[PDB]
């Protein structure tokens, strides 16, 4: 197995292009209420999970929810792309605020995989361009993650590694 | 039927004792995303919709989601007991902030009706004094609702009346 160790209380930040398998993975490994997704929050504020114009409002809600969960000592997983340092920054700050370990889980997959998964989605397929951009942003992000403040940085380099993941707590 | 007319830009506040059929009613009449419930918010912040220790955080979250929705011009229904004036006040204020009409839908049913439904619930049952207290607080609330800032006050007086409700946009 690919064992990924996390404290019983931590902020797990999933990092991956659209189509890399973040939501599927989060559902496999965590309780439904431990996962806050940006899609879900777009739905909460707008009725429409695919409404790209309510991003700011959705993340405000996501951030505030994360804040409450850490305040109360609840393990939390952020299901969003998180490929831009600017998106990760507030999460680290929140985890810092509540003295919680931020943990990076990176879906470092070949663009080609995300593109073909995207091609076969039945919900919201994105433009190829989006995944080209996300993937390159992800690639430029890996090096600096530890310095950004992530206490553990876990990089998954193939679907075979992702599939063999097991989280050990403590 | 019993037609309740609301504008497209409404904050619909359900007001009813535990066991009065608020959540059931909300699911029947509104889109899933239109309904924000205190139970659901308890789950968001605690993993547990029945967790009574997290009230402050849950209602903080509910109020924030409400404000974001009304700011975006999205109809919203608050699914919480709402029998205390102090509960209703922050909701009214948020609605006014974004030029939204606060609408009260009141489940003015006999205590016995809720007590009986309560004993049959599978999700979580409350002690009898809870429903007795809610019903008395509700009955004491009715007269003053319009004055509190609700633009339309709809009082439903029996399970028959509740069952016959149809919402019409005003719009
Ligand atoms: N391990 C996997 N192998 C093959 N297909 C997958 C895998 N994980 C997810 N998918 C599929 O790829 C698409 C993207 O998955 P999803 O979890 O929605 O990714 P994301 O949340 O990162 O956009 C979905 O159609 C999903 O069913
Ligand atoms: N019209 C009705 N007749 C009989 N039982 C009902 C009716 N509406 C709701 N119930 C039941 O009563 C219980 C309380 O309903 P619910 O909508 O959860 O109330 P609340 O949300 O106000 O606590 C549930 O078990 C529900 O199935
Ligand atoms: Mg997803
Ligand atoms: Mg309910």
UniProtKB/TrEMBL annotation, chain A:
Binding site for Mg(2+) 1: 23
Taxonomic superkingdom: Bacteria
Residues engaged in binding Mg(2+) 2: 23, 79
Residues at which dATP binds: 18-24, 121, 124
Positions of ATP 1 binding: 18-19, 21-24, 121, 124
Residues annotated for CTP binding in this entry: 18-19, 21-24, 121, 124
Ligand binding (ADP 1): 19-24, 121
Record-listed GTP binding positions: 18-19, 21-24, 121, 124
Residues where GDP binds: 19-24, 121
Residue numbers binding UTP: 18-19, 21-24, 121, 124
Protein name per UniProt: Metallophosphoesterase
């Amino acid at each position: 197995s690919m064992k990924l160790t996390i404290p019983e209380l931590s902020l797990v930040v999933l990092i991956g292009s659209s189509g890399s398998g973040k939501s599927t993975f989060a559902k496999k490994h965590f309780k439904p209420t431990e996962v806050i997704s940006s899609d879900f929050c777009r739905g909460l504020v707008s009725d429409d999970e695919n409404d790209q114009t309510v991003t700011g409002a959705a993340f405000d809600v996501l951030h505030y929810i994360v804040s409450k969960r850490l305040q109360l000592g609840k393990l939390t997983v952020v299901d969003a792309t998180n490929v831009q340092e600017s998106a990760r920054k507030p999460l680290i700050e929140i985890a810092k605020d509540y003295h919680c370990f931020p943990v990076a889980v990176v879906f470092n997959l070949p663009e080609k995989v995300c593109q073909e998964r995207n091609k076969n989605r039945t919900d919201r397929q994105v433009e190829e361009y989006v995944i080209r951009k996300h993937t390159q942003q992800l690639k430029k992000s890996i090096k600096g993650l530890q310095r950004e403040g992530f206490r553990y940085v876990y990089i998954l380099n193939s679907p075979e590694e992702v599939e063999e993941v097991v989280f050990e707590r403590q």
